[PDB]
Design an enzyme around this catalytic site. Structure first.
Site, short mmCIF file in Angstrom:
data_model
loop_
_atom_site.label_atom_id
_atom_site.label_comp_id
_atom_site.label_asym_id
_atom_site.label_seq_id
_atom_site.Cartn_x
_atom_site.Cartn_y
_atom_site.Cartn_z
N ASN B 9 117.56 -51.82 110.58
CA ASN B 9 116.22 -52.25 110.15
C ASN B 9 116.38 -53.23 108.99
O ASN B 9 116.70 -52.80 107.87
CB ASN B 9 115.38 -51.05 109.74
N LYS B 11 114.17 -54.87 107.59
CA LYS B 11 112.93 -54.88 106.80
C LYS B 11 112.51 -56.32 106.54
O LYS B 11 112.83 -57.23 107.34
CB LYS B 11 113.06 -54.03 105.53
N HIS B 95 107.54 -46.13 110.70
CA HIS B 95 108.47 -46.14 109.57
C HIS B 95 107.76 -45.57 108.33
O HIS B 95 106.58 -45.85 108.09
CB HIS B 95 108.96 -47.56 109.30
N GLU B 97 107.68 -46.39 105.29
CA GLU B 97 107.01 -47.38 104.41
C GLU B 97 105.61 -47.66 104.97
O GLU B 97 104.68 -47.86 104.20
CB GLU B 97 107.86 -48.65 104.26
N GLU B 165 113.70 -39.70 108.71
CA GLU B 165 113.88 -40.34 107.39
C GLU B 165 113.70 -39.28 106.30
O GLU B 165 112.58 -38.76 106.14
CB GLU B 165 112.87 -41.47 107.19
N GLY B 171 115.05 -42.92 96.52
CA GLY B 171 114.61 -43.34 95.17
C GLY B 171 114.14 -42.21 94.25
O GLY B 171 113.38 -42.53 93.32
N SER B 211 120.35 -42.49 103.71
CA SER B 211 121.40 -43.35 103.15
C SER B 211 122.62 -43.24 104.05
O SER B 211 123.31 -42.19 104.08
CB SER B 211 121.74 -42.98 101.72
#
Ligand code: NA
Ligand code: NA
Lengths: 248, 248
Positions: B9, B11, B95, B97, B165, B171, B211
């Site tokens: 991906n 992005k 996704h 996001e 995911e 983060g 990750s």
């Protein structure tokens, strides 16, 4: 005098074969000089490189949207700096379909406009009220609030064109007259003169984003505060050329 | 046996020059046979034709999103039938996001998956829980609800890959172990066996979208219920090739 402006919003339409035929028809078109009309066409993202590489150099290309800030971790979005890399000079922001269906708020649209202009894009910023808003007596309250969210975030209007979409006349059985278009464009320009400056009001194109066709384009274009059009479905058709010719 | 699957991906990243270098590096890569790994790369919309026209024929191209229904009056969106016209075989849907930042609901994602499959696309359908959801004890409640909204709308799973995911490890200072990945993939597969069928559970790839790097890809890939990866930033880099090589 404000240079007449005709944008064509293809929306989410097109195949490679249809795009080639649309571009060929635009390339063969004979329209008023560059001194009296500015023409922008807006394909879907996947056709931006194809249209930019094949379209006549005196017509310009727009994206239909872009992201609000610097790209990097936003799956599915296209950043302003990506459009600049591809030499796409324009972007449409705040289209009524994105405000209503994808819930883009006035502040989100304003942040997009500011970011696009900062990256060097030229912007067609869209505003407009629904039938429920118009029938509540809220037309200019809505259009002023949408415009204010952009104005609060814009320090230079040279590269902005405002498009008024009469969303109230789009699929409702209601029809907008040239007088009704002129009334909103006049009141919006008067708002810009008071809230930004007389100079910005006098020089900013305000284009009409309602039903535009060969039948109505000269009467609409000749209104004192209408500076051109943001065309929908006719933008895919040879009729788009008749709409450009309203600039004559 | 389920064929190992590696998606990249990209992005909202890329310039024409960077895309050419990424595609050249993929074209020069020497990776396991087509019989043991399936490789999909996902550029931004504006680079889909360029990547499809230049990428080695044994790697496949995905869009990062598509619209929920037939195109025509949705400014800024790209329809499934447009991707099919451009011979783009895959799409990433849901996704994290887009679920979080653009507020795509589980039902909206499920409607997109159904429409994409109906048009002939293959789908990477993404699910995953936040740190607040994980710390509330809600991991499998969330992942099952997201999956159920897709399953309720899907009548054939042949052309679906599910990506988990671990949004809780993205983060936050929290890190996901191979055991933690395996636990979710196992529980999700068990959910599919009970709610869809034993055959769909046994044959559907469930790929890890946390990750992934050269350091961790073999230990993660060797987990019993991990069938490959949905890679983020490494997908732009030569390291993506090391991740494909976990299939060996
Ligand atoms: Na006029
Ligand atoms: Na495995």
């Amino acid at each position: 005098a404000r240079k007449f402006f005709v944008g064509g919003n293809w929306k989410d339409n097109g195949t490679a074969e249809e795009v080639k035929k649309i571009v060929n028809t635009l390339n063969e078109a004979q329209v008023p000089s560059q001194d009296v009309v500015e023409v922008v066409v807006s394909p879907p993202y996947v056709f931006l490189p194809l249209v930019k590489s094949t379209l006549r150099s005196d017509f310009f290309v727009a994206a239909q949207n872009c992201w609000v800030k610097k790209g990097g971790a936003f799956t599915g979005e296209v950043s302003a700096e990506m459009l600049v890399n591809l030499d796409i000079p324009w972007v449409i922001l705040g289209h009524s379909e994105r405000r209503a269906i994808l819930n883009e708020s006035s502040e989100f649209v304003g942040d997009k406009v500011a970011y696009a202009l900062a990256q060097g894009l030229k912007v067609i910023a869209c505003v407009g009220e629904t039938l429920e808003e118009r029938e509540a007596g809220s037309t200019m309250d809505v259009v002023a609030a949408q415009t204010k969210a952009i104005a609060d975030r814009v320090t230079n209007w040279s590269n902005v064109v405002i498009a008024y979409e009469p969303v109230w006349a789009i699929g409702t059985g209601k029809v907008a007259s040239p007088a009704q278009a002129q009334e909103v464009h006049d009141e919006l320009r008067k708002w810009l003169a008071k809230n930004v400056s007389a100079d910005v009001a006098a020089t900013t194109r305000i284009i009409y984003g309602g039903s535009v066709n060969g039948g109505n384009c000269k009467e609409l274009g000749g209104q004192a505060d209408v500076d051109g059009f943001l065309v929908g479905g006719a933008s895919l058709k040879p009729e788009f050329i008749d709409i450009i010719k309203a600039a004559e």
